[PDB]
Structure 1
Amino acid sequence: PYNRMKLMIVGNTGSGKTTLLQQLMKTKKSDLGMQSATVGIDVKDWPIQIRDKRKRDLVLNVWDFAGREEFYSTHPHFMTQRALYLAVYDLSKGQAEVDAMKPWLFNIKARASSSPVILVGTHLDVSKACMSKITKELLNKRGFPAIRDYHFVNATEESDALAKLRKTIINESLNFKIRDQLVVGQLIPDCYVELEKIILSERKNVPIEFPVIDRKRLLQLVRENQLQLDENELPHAVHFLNESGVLLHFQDPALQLSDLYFVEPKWLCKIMAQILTVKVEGCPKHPKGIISRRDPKNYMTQYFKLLEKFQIALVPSSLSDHRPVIELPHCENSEIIIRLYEMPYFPMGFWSRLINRLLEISPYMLALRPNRMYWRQGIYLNWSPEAYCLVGSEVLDNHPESFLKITVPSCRKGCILLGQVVDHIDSLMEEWFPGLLEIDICGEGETLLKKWALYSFNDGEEHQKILLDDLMKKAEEGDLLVNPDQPRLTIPISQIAPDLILADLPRNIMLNNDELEFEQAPEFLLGDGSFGSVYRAAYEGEEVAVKIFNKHTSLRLLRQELVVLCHLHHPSLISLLAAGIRPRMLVMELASKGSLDRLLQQDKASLTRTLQHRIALHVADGLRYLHSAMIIYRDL
């Protein structure tokens, strides 16, 4: 059995986080007469030898996150899903701090939906305890994660009030049970536990200035012991030690550091936050947020060979909060496309992640870089008054939510940017904060993120742009026009949401249903292959092969695939002809004589030593182009 959990501590610039933990672990000394605010996240671990009938000596490692609002850009890296999050009121500011703690509870919900939460009122010594009302009224069961308890400890001395909290941490840990699993007591191969013991035993034998380990040194540690793990086991083994917080390691291929194995996590988590505090009270020769490489043995080079790898390099945080007044060229209510993203709170590492996903995309309209001006919560990268994109963030009136307005010119060069930013902003939402876009069937389908779209029948002077949920409007694909209860005038959906309709991709691949003659239902036209899915049809009087998609592939992925298929264009690669909705189909060329495997299976006499060559020449011509565009076929 593997008894090791993560106990995340969570607060905001003034709480019993680092002074409540010292009493939870019963650190008897706390020799520092006066300690200071946290930098980084201070990873520590305390064992819990429950002197009882059960000899399970679980050891859960605490991560007392820093509360100051300048480190928030890095926390979502370390808010995993196998953890029991805490939360601290500071009841001294009663009924006003519980409000200031909703963002933390929300990010806990965004990152790790299926994890418990234990609110811990840290102040009793100093006074107001009716805050248990609001926590039961507004904070209990409304979009926020599953709060499993709430206590009011003193947080400076051991007491009966605190002892019963230490007991709840135990009983809530030993009953984690995500998808009926009881995480804290699962079975794992002893090959891992022994690998855990050597890394901890190696943490004492590494250069403190750089505790990092390379895979070369690692593959020798197993040789010193008798570990039965092979090169095919470590990539899984050293990951299971990552989720348990024993060492940090990142398997991303883009971030070329996968040889670096971060033992002693409390160190890397501290270094990444030294840059976010180094100020200069000299000369503001630069605007706020930008900084050049101003600082040991080759480490400084390794330093932002990791910060840049960690995206924190230009510091996308602490960057000109005040926004600059932009005056867009064409703003007459009919040339702009807008799409809000109403969500209750901006997740922790949202903007520093977003403005660093669109930033590195200079090859829009494809390598002509646009001169951009990105404050903390916007980008506004513009090529010309006929093609721009302002991913802003404003607060509406009488609304406590947080919106993400994106305005783009409705021309052709603008329909691309919208359909290309909405992708990145969604490829980020489901990759990082997957519990935002999560259908909470309990209660009602609020979905916590309502991506509105804005439309107006009056081209100009409409006095307002009427909201229209995307989920409801996407279901209006049976036709192509939207129109009010006064059905005289109507708006083409292309104009208000040119991404649901495949209008952003190259214009030559619009389905143009007027000519496609296609009978889905019958199978005698489904002749392609055997009992498959791609049918046969006619498109512009010629024979083609349409590929009906089942319910699996969501539209967000179909749009994600067509963008790479649309620019291959080789005489030795099946080329697209159209793609549309009603239903989600994909049109391509009809290979008249069918695939090759069917040929040499029953028509082995057709290959004639000069068709055996032209086939091999046309396939080596395709690979001559795929490997030129830096893409490997992986299955031939």
Structure 2
Amino acid sequence: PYNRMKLMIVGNTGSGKTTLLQQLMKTKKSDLGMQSATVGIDVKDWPIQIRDKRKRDLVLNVWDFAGREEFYSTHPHFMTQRALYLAVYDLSKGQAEVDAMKPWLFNIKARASSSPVILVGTHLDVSKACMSKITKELLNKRGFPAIRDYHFVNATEESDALAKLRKTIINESLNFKIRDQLVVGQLIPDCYVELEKIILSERKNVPIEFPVIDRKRLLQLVRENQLQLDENELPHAVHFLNESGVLLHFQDPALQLSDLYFVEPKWLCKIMAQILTVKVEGCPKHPKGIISRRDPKNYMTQYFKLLEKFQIALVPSSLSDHRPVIELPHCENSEIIIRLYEMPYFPMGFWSRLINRLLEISPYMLALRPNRMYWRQGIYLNWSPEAYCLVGSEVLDNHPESFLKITVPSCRKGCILLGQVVDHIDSLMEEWFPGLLEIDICGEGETLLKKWALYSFNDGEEHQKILLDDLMKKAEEGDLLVNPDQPRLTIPISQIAPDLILADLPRNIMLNNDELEFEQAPEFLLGDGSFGSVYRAAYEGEEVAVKIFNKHTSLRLLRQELVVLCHLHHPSLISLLAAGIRPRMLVMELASKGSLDRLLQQDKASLTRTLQHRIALHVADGLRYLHSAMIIYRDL
């Protein structure tokens, strides 16, 4: 059995975070009479030898996150889904700080959507006990994560309330049980436990200034002991240990640090927050937010290399919260495509990653350089009055949510930019915050995020753009135009959302449904292959092979495949001819003789002993072109 969880503490800018934990841990000393606000996340671990019939002496680690808003950019890295979350009221300012909790709870829901949260009042000596009303009214079960219990400990001193809170923590930890698994008492191989023991023992035998450990040292320690791990067991073992928080290791190939292992996580977390606290009150030659290389044994390079790897370097935090007024050339309600991403709150590490994803993409419309101005919530990378992209962030009147208004020109060069930024935002959103884009069939189908598109029938002077949900607009794919209740006038789909229709791709891949005849229902035209999804049809008067896609392939994935398939164009590689919707198909050249495997299986005599050379030459040419295109075929 494995008995180890994470008890993360959550709250804002000064509350019972480092004070509550002391009596929760029953730390008697409390030598620091006046302690400062937390820098980093302050990892600590404390075992609970439960004095009852059950003897599961579980040891769990607390990560009491810093509450100041300047460290908020790095917190979502350490928000795992295998943990129990706390919250702190600061009941001194009752009925007000409960509202201040809502961004934190929303972030917890976005990151760890299936973990219980326990709310804890941290003031009784001062004041205002009506906060439990609002917690029972709007904060209970309205989009927020699954609240389990709420407490009102005095925090300054031990008491019956604190004991009840500790028992509640014990009960909720021992009854975690995500999707009926009972994590707190699951079963793992003993090799993992032994590796954890040796790692936490070696934690005390590393240099303080640099506890980073190379993979060679880990292979040394596995050799010194009698572990039964091989090269094929470490990639899962260290990942499981990382999920338990014993040591942080990163498996992203793009960020070239997977060789290093970060034992003693508190050191790494504290170093991550050192740059965010240094300032200069001198001459403001540089705008607020930008910074260059300014001040040990070769560690200086590794520092900002790690910051760049984490994308904390230009410091996206403390970066010019006020935006300068921007006056676009064409804003006559018809030359601009606008899309909105209405969400209840902005997730913590959203903008610092977003303005760090579109930033590095210089080869747009492909290498020329774009002008750019960065603020805490925008990019606005613009090339010319006819080619730009403004990814802003405003609040609508009489609207408590947060919006992400992307404004792009509607011309040829704007469709590409809109589809390329929408794809990046969607990928970020589904990769970092899966709890937001999560369907909710139970209850109303809110999904928390409503992606709107703005459209106006009148060619300018409409004075207002009508909203339209992107899913409802997507279901309107039967035709090619949208129209109101008064159908005398209509708007093409391409002008208001050129990403749903395959418009951001090069126009030489138009479906051209008028001249295409194709019978999907019969199977005698499926003869290409055997029980496949490819059919035979005729397009432009020529015999071709179409590839009908099932419901599995999403539109975004298909577009991401087509954008790289369209630019290949070699005479030894099957070249695309068209693609389109109704249904999601793909037309390509028809190989008259079919694949080579069937011929080898049944027509072994057809090869005239010199075709065996021509096939090899053509395949070699194809492989040469593919490797010249810096793409690896991987399955031939």
TM-score over 0.5 for the alignment? Answer: yes
- Note the alpha carbon deviations across 1:588-633, whole angstroms, 9 max, x for none: 1111111111111111112222211111111111211222222111
Summarize deviations over 1:268-320 as a string: whole Å, max 9, x none. Answer: 11111111110101111100110001010110111111100110111111100
SS across alignment from 2:191:
helix
Q: Deviations over 1:410-438 (max 9, x none)?
A: 00100100011000000000000011011
Deviation at 1:563, TM superposition (A): 1.4
Distance 1:628 1:248 in 2: 37
After alignment, is 562-571 or 59-68 more displaced? 562-571
CA deviations on 1:151-200 (whole Å, 9 max, x unpaired) are 00111111001110001111001111111111111000100000000110
**In 1, Cα distance between equivalents of 2:24 and 2:570:** 66
Provide the C-alpha distance between the structure 1 equivalents of 2:129 and 2:614, rounded to a whole number of angstroms.
83
Secondary structure of the corresponding residue to residue 46 of structure 1: strand
Which SS does the other structure have where 1:172 is aligned?
A: helix
Secondary structure of the corresponding residue to residue 86 of structure 2: strand
- Superposition deviation, residue 391 in structure 1: 0.5
- Return 514-523 or 555-564, whichever deviates more: 555-564
Query: Residue 207 of structure 1 aligns to a residue in which SS?
Result: coil
- Structure 1 CA distance, aligned partners of 2:223 and 2:331? 68
C-alpha distance in 1, partners of 2:557/2:124? 52
SS in 2 for 1:341: strand
Matches of 2:393 and 2:510, distance apart in 1: 33
Q: After superposition, give the CA deviation of every residue in 1:448-495 in whole Å (9 maximum; x if it has no partner).
A: 000000000001110100000001000000101000000110000000
2:380 alignment partner in structure 1: 380
Q: Which moved more, 1:434-443 or 1:335-344?
A: 434-443
Task: Find the counterpart in structure 1 of residue 342 from structure 2.
Answer: 342
Matched with 1:98 is: 98
Counterpart CA distance in 2 for 1:607 and 1:584 is 37
Structure 1 segments (4+ residues) deviating >3 Å: none
**Using the alignment, how far apart are the partners of 2:250 and 2:265 within structure 1?**
12
Say which is worse superposed, 605-614 or 242-251, in terms of deviation. Answer: 605-614
What is the Cα deviation at residue 572 of structure 1?
1.8
Distance in 2 separating the partners of 1:608 and 1:284: 79
Q: Secondary structure at the match of 2:70?
A: coil
Q: Which moved more, 1:434-443 or 1:478-487?
A: 434-443
Worse-matched range after superposition: 214-223 or 549-558: 549-558
SS at match of 1:326: coil
Aligned match of 1:521: 521
**Quick one: distance in 2 between partners of 1:572 and 1:372?**
42
Secondary structure of the 1:7 match is strand
Which stretch has the larger CA shift, 436-445 or 111-120?
Answer: 436-445
- In structure 1, C-alpha distance between the alignment counterparts of 2:618 and 2:271, rounded to whole Å: 53
C-alpha deviation, 1:534, in angstroms: 1.0
SS of the equivalent of 1:44 reads strand
Q: Is residue 492 of structure 2 the alignment partner of residue 470 of structure 1?
A: no
Deviation for aligned residue 1:578: 1.1
Distance 1:587 1:297 in 2: 59
Q: Alignment partner of 2:615: what SS?
A: helix
CA distance in structure 1 between the aligned counterparts of 2:391 and 2:303, rounded to whole angstroms: 31
| Paired residue secondary structure (1:395) | coil
**Stretch of structure 1 that moved more, 446-455 or 587-596:** 587-596
How far the C-alpha of 1:565 sits from its partner, in A, is 1.0
The C-alpha deviation readout for 1:223-247, integer Å capped at 9, x for no partner, is 0100000000000000000000000
Q: By how many angstroms is 1:387 displaced?
A: 0.8
| Partner residue in 1 for 2:557 | 557
Deviation at 1:322, TM superposition (A): 0.4
Cα distance in 1 for partners of 2:378, 2:39 equals: 27
Q: Percent sequence identity over matched residues? A: 100
Deviations 1:353-383 (A, max 9, x none): 1000000100111121211112110101011
Instruction: Tell me the number of residue pairs that the alignment of Structure 1 and Structure 2 aligns.
Output: 636
Residues 74-129 of structure 1 show CA distances to partners (whole Å, capped at 9, x for unaligned) of: 00000010011111110110000000110000000000100000011111111111
Q: Deviations over 1:564-593 (max 9, x none)?
A: 111111112211111111011111111111
Q: Secondary structure at the match of 1:294?
A: coil
In 1, Cα distance between equivalents of 2:486 and 2:128? 55
SS of the residue 1:49 aligns to:
coil
Listed one character per residue, the Cα deviations across residues 378-415 of structure 1 (whole Å, up to 9, x for unaligned) are 10101111110001111110000000000100001001
TM-score under structure 1 length normalisation: 0.99
Partners of 1:14 and 1:335 lie apart in 2 by 48
Match of 1:6 in 2: 6
| Range 582-591 or range 472-481, more displaced | 582-591
Question: Cα distance, 1:517 vs. partner?
Answer: 1.1
- In the alignment, structure 2 segments of 5+ residues that lack a partner are none
Instruction: Tell me, in whole angstroms, the C-alpha distance in 2 between the residues paired with 1:412 and 1:278.
Output: 45
1:43-62 CA distance string (max 9 Å, x none) = 11100110111110111100
Give the Cα separation in 2 of the matches to 1:376 and 1:516: 50
Q: How does 1:169-568 map to 2 (within 5 A)?
A: 169-568=169-568
Structure-2 separation of matches of 1:620 and 1:306: 41
Cα deviation digits, residues 308-353 of structure 1 (max 9, x gap): 0110111111100000100001111000000000000000000001
Give, in whole Å, the separation in 1 of the partners of 2:332 and 2:619: 53
SS at match of 2:514: coil
Q: Output the CA distance in 2 between the equivalents of 1:527 and 1:344.
A: 51
Q: Tell me, in whole angstroms, the C-alpha distance in 2 between the residues paired with 1:595 and 1:252.
A: 37
- How far the C-alpha of 1:532 sits from its partner, in A, is 0.8
Identify which range, 393-402 or 618-627, moves more after superposition.
618-627
Provide the rounded CA distance (Å) in 1 between the counterparts of 2:3 and 2:226: 23
Separation in 1 of the partners of 2:371 and 2:136? 50
Give the 3-state SS of the residue equivalent to 1:525 in structure 2.
Answer: helix
What is the rounded CA distance, in whole Å, between the counterparts of 2:431 and 2:69 in structure 1? Answer: 23
Task: Give me the whole-angstrom Cα distance separating, in 1, the residues matched to 2:626 and 2:146.
Answer: 49
Q: How well do the aligned residues superpose, as a CA RMSD in angstroms?
A: 0.7
Please give the secondary structure, in 2, of the residue aligned with 1:535: strand
| TM-score, with length taken from structure 2 | 0.99
Task: Answer with 330-339 or 585-594: which moved more.
Answer: 585-594
Q: For residues 377 and 498 of structure 1, what CA distance do their matches in structure 2 show? A: 25
SS in 1 for 2:525: coil
* Per-residue Cα deviation, 1:127-168 (whole angstroms, up to 9, x for no partner): 111110100100000000000010001111110011100011
How far, CA to CA, are the matches of 1:61 and 1:161 in structure 2? 22
Q: Give the secondary structure class of the aligned counterpart of 2:165.
A: helix
1:78 has 2:78 as partner: yes
- SS of the equivalent of 2:421 reads helix
Question: Which SS does the other structure have where 1:327 is aligned?
Answer: coil
Q: Distance in 2 between matches of 1:193 and 1:169?
A: 24
Secondary structure at the residue paired with 2:2?
Answer: coil
**Separation in structure 1 between the aligned mates of residue 389 and residue 504 of structure 2, nearest angstrom:** 14
How far apart are the structure 1 equivalents of 2:264 and 2:608? 65
| Alpha-carbon distance between aligned partners in 1 of 2:459 and 2:539, rounded to the nearest angstrom | 36
Instruction: Give me the whole-angstrom Cα distance separating, in 2, the residues matched to 1:615 and 1:350.
Output: 51
In 1: Cα distance, 2:413 partner to 2:247 partner: 47
Q: Distance in 1 between matches of 2:609 and 2:268?
A: 62
Which runs of 5 or more structure 1 residues have no equivalent in the other structure? none
Q: Secondary structure at the match of 1:428?
A: helix
Question: Matched residues in 1 for 2:109 and 2:461: separation?
Answer: 41
CA distance in 2, matches of 1:122, 1:580: 59
